Symmetry: C3
Subunit: 517 residues, 3 copies
């Protein structure tokens, strides 16, 4: 049942003009600003908006605008100018707060906050405290947030309002945060699960660029991260902290671009509690230094990636120009696979402390630190299978090596060739090896050296035996262990365990005594 009432100017007029409504009552508002043409209906004690009476173009237009508005909350609705001059902080915060949501999964709640093309001046922290909120701009540079924050706070701070809980499915897409070299954090993420970030920039923040604490299961695709951090104050391009109760895990950085940061590009911090950061990945990422003119040059003395973490996957990443180690590792079972390293003052991969079961596989590069190596000789067992320029070791673990020994195929234990010298990583132990040459003088050779007394000192290799086309060539005596005569083959020289005499069993099988004078 529809019962048309006479129209009123505004919705505010409805209660005044009609203070005793009845069921089925239908009225149109006709002079209500941008709400004009809306039709309301008294239903179950409330006036309800209906799409039923669209005969008039203005009523149909209002219905269709309502539907079109469900795509996104446009920050322009809340008064942003986007001109880089007006302070847009309050309007952006209001547009975010207008989305009804809650914490954790919050299924069926949330949406997009859309930032059209522009420059948005932000002067205080903007907080996102509910699940399922995505901030989406017009493009990685078309939409730019320009910060004047100088108190160390983030421009965008994602964190649950109740920190015993979590925010799920938040993200940023297609926009830039520009710190303008002020002391602010670009983006702060805390207690987030299942975040989704795509093609966004964080640049020129003198605090952390992207700060991450106890974040789980979050994909970050196409991040552009430059000119962030402050080495002296321990601020970095991306800082990943475990926090005090759990950890950060399953952060996946895919096809990201880190360049010319003032701290490290990526800094893992697992000191917050015993649960260490784990199972984070960098796939196809670029780690590019600050000053290509020289090393050290103007490049900060900090690793491109500080990895205080376990089970990190560093897959086909590019490292260039670093006044430290490219990757400084403090943790276990990290995976460095198919990476290329070009020009650093330290190691490509520095396995520090008790780091163990890390793997360097399919990697290459050039120009590690002078007198150093692609990787160090670590305390515990780690594994490698790679071919770097200037490194003779090709595959090994702990102190067992398959290596190039001056053009020979070599199988060495506790020794390897570096430059012209043979290095003994464990100085309290001896060194032994086989090396297989392709010249007839060397043939297959056996080598050894005593314990030098000092880890990583050098040794002289003694050749013990050569096997060549014209002889078995012992350089030390042949020392027999006695055996029984019945065990011996025809034409066998042996010491008989029955009487400890040197004997020869000839071609007929007869045991004879070797005459000694």
């Amino acid at each position: 049942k529809t019962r048309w009432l006479n129209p009123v100017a505004t919705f505010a007029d409805i209660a005044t003009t009609y203070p005793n409504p009845q069921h089925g009552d239908t009225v149109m508002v006709t002079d209500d600003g941008e709400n004009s043409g809306s039709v309301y209906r008294y239903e179950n004690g409330q006036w309800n908006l209906t799409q039923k009476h669209n005969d008039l173009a203005i009523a149909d237009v209002q219905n269709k605008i309502g539907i079109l508005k469900t795509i996104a909350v446009n920050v322009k609705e809340f008064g942003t100018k986007g001109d880089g001059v007006t302070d847009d902080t309050v309007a952006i915060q209001n547009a975010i707060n207008s989305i009804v949501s809650s914490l954790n999964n919050a299924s069926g709640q949330g949406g997009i906050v859309y930032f059209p093309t522009g420059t948005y001046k932000v002067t205080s922290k903007i907080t996102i405290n509910k699940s399922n909120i995505r901030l989406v701009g017009a493009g990685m540079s078309a939409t730019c947030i320009k910060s004047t924050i100088t108190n160390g706070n983030p421009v965008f701070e994602f964190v649950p309002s109740d920190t015993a809980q979590r925010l799920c499915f938040v993200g940023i897409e297609k926009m830039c945060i520009d710190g303008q070299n002020n002391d602010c954090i670009g983006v702060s993420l805390k207690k987030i699960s299942l975040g989704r970030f795509l093609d966004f920039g964080v640049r020129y923040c003198a605090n952390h660029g992207l700060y991450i604490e106890e974040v789980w299961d979050t994909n970050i695709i196409g991040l552009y991260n430059t000119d962030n951090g402050d080495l002296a104050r321990n601020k970095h391009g991306v800082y990943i902290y475990n926090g005090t109760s759990d950890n950060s895990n399953r952060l996946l950085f895919i096809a990201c671009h880190f360049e010319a940061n003032n701290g490290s590009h990526v800094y893992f911090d697992s000191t917050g509690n015993r649960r260490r950061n784990g199972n984070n990945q960098f796939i196809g990422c670029k780690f590019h230094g600050k000053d290509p003119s020289a090393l050290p040059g103007n490049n900060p003395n900090t690793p491109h990636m500080y990895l205080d973490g376990d089970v990190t996957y560093v897959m086909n990443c590019y490292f260039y120009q670093c006044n430290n180690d490219f990757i400084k590792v403090k943790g276990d079972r990290n995976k460095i696979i198919g990476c290329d390293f070009y020009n650093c003052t330290g190691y490509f991969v520095n396995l520090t402390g008790t780091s163990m079961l890390n793997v360097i596989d399919g990697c290459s590069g050039q120009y590690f630190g002078s007198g150093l190596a692609p990787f160090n000789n670590p305390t515990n067992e780690n594994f490698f299978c790679s071919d770097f320029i200037g490194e003779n070791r090709k595959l090994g673990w702990n102190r067992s090596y398959i290596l190039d020994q001056g053009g020979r195929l070599a199988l060495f234990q506790n020794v390897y060739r570096s430059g012209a010298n043979f290095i003994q990583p464990k100085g309290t132990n001896a060194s032994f090896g086989i090396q297989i040459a392709d010249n007839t003088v060397d043939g297959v050779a056996f080598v050894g050296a005593n314990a030098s007394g000092t880890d990583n000192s050098n040794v002289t290799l003694t050749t013990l035996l050569n096997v060549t086309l014209d002889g078995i060539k012992p350089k030390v005596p042949i020392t027999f262990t006695p055996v029984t005569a019945s065990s011996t083959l025809n034409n066998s020289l042996f010491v008989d365990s029955a009487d400890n005499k040197l004997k020869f069993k000839d071609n007929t099988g007869t045991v004879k005594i070797v005459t000694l004078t």
Copy 2:
């Protein structure tokens, strides 16, 4: 009963723009001389003047709205409520059906079906059967389809309307399908090519979570798949079937998240015909068990990934907590590279049956099943190059091993060290090897053991020879092959082939007979 159409210039344009008017269709004319602003309503086979505007701005608004509507078909245009209580099935289907399209490429046809923030109750199967239809929500949880289907049917069924053709360029983005633990399939994909899926969830489906039959060349990025399947009825989180004519191939799962499924996370089934599933990929994916408190615990007895397929790429994936093998392989040339495995009751990788030329490269992990190993000893040749905790073998293929033998670099054939034992995998063959130590007692050692007659049995390694700093030390006799005396260098001991006598050629080239008694 009104449907507003886009404005036209004049009355003469009505018949040419709208050749099939329906009852209640309504249109305004904008540039028609003195009749500008006239509004016509189609009723009783005729256009009837019903309204007339003076200011034509209303037509300008209608026109801009018409252009804005071209970006997507909003399901709310067809009466969906998104309140979680209204059955929205028919309205969603009507919105999908409103897009005119074709099969195969269907160039220039199709579009987006957009689901605003909300909960959508679906009570029967919704079918997408034309190309180029994408279902798109406001976010992985912000838009949520709640299924009440209990008969095994999918919530969303993608299948070509003609099964001799293909459905191309379909997908789902930014939404969740929630089976509410009912017997329904979350998403069914059949005979698809070039699908594109991004950041969508399939959860709590008691049938298959994602069912895939004969799908080609489809990218799935950021899928979140949990609590699906039914082990007792062979239903799984993702079920990949070849079907009866062809196969599923080039399914790329990138950065996906599988957790707490009641079946296998991923189950490949090539039993439909001779063309086996091939060339599918999992990159950076997570495979997380149901019950982290204990193993077996409440974890289903089923591999995290059952791989009845060939040339699968499992790249930098994470595997945790499985009451079976992590990866059960039935097929050839699968690649397991840079993966990490933690805690299962079977093998990390079980190469069953005739599986051959699979590779396990740069992996690590801990806590394979008691008494087992990271991988099994398979029938046919497979390849590995990884360093696992508790596994001495580092690189190998078939029964050829490079391994750690108690701190030594060891190159072994048909024997490896497991714990304190030496295992002979092929019992019909003897075992031989070299082990290179870093102590002077051992030096370079040669070892062997006779064929035991029992596969995988424990053998004793006999030391045959040590090459050390102070001697070449044979533990068996020196057995000469007779050679000619001209062939010998000075200072040579040899048996002469002329007379089968042990001789010595001294420092001057003189051959003398070793006196025997």
Copy 3:
């Protein structure tokens, strides 16, 4: 319930025009001054004002529209028909030209140009000369640009208007360029930085499909590239040129699909200047030939990937059906990791010229060219660690090999087994090796051969020594180097350097002369 009558001018004209009003009759009065737009409904027995169109409210409603329009510039606003019949070239260019932007970063400017579902006939080159412009359609086939260009120009040309600068943050998403077999380039990219492309197709272009010159730091996800190029004219699916000033670098192709191209799928060209293409990546990409029925068949005689570049990452890619080498390399430190190769006429990976320090790791495949191998024997050092069908060598660099030697574990220098033959790669050097068997006749064997004189010739391996369970078995003499008597252990045979006599220190510690006659 409602019956719309013809409008009247004034309220007073209602009674005179319809003296016989029925229930539900509805009329608008249109020229009553202030009261124009009022709608009256005959209810019960009066005419009742029920609805009203306010001309002065439409301005406010327009503000909402203007906000909605900030999401994107829709080409339909500029007069596209999208029917494939009308030339849409000028309307699309006008739409793009209406974007307000500039060059380099151009922060806070730019936006999306949106192409709704349709077929867009384009007859001459469309240019994008300003930063931050993204071309977005409704789907990879739903929005299709149909080219009639035949003069070799591109359909879309992205290049800075000022070539002293760069174009930044441009892209294409969700649309197809269809060249209709005309002589046009699909998409041309030049002097671009930080491009972002997603799920777009380039097909049936008889010039290059995608031409790329001096492009930096650009992500390309889900590209579909088929039926492009023309081998007779040196046109290819994707052509990446360094240009004359710098190079192309950090191009990331992720989950891309290259199929049935008429040139090479990917052609790198570094001939423009000294700075070679570098650090480009292919992750999860498909490279599929033209004619699966036969090889050579109809397949173009050109590699699937021509790699004149350095530090390229080819990660877990799929290669199938090539009438040439699958990857023809001219460069250094490229990485071929986890790829699979099936059926080509040349090598899987052809390291040509001075190509050095490339890695082939974790790869497999079947059916390289008749009498060839998975990879060639290159001039300079390259590294491999993979298990291919029909290739005995498993790990190696230069001429140092770990291989399967007829079922033995073998460590060979300058020789490897190929079928029934042993090949000596460097003809001027000898060959030596160790092979470790699992049979009691062979045990651990030492093998060698003289230099053949001819590179890659067949040689015979001479067994020099067997170490078995029943003896140390020299096939050539034991040739002693003289040592001092005091250095000998008990039971030691040696030549004494004091007098060059063969002596034995027996079990009693006494040095005795071995009696000779």
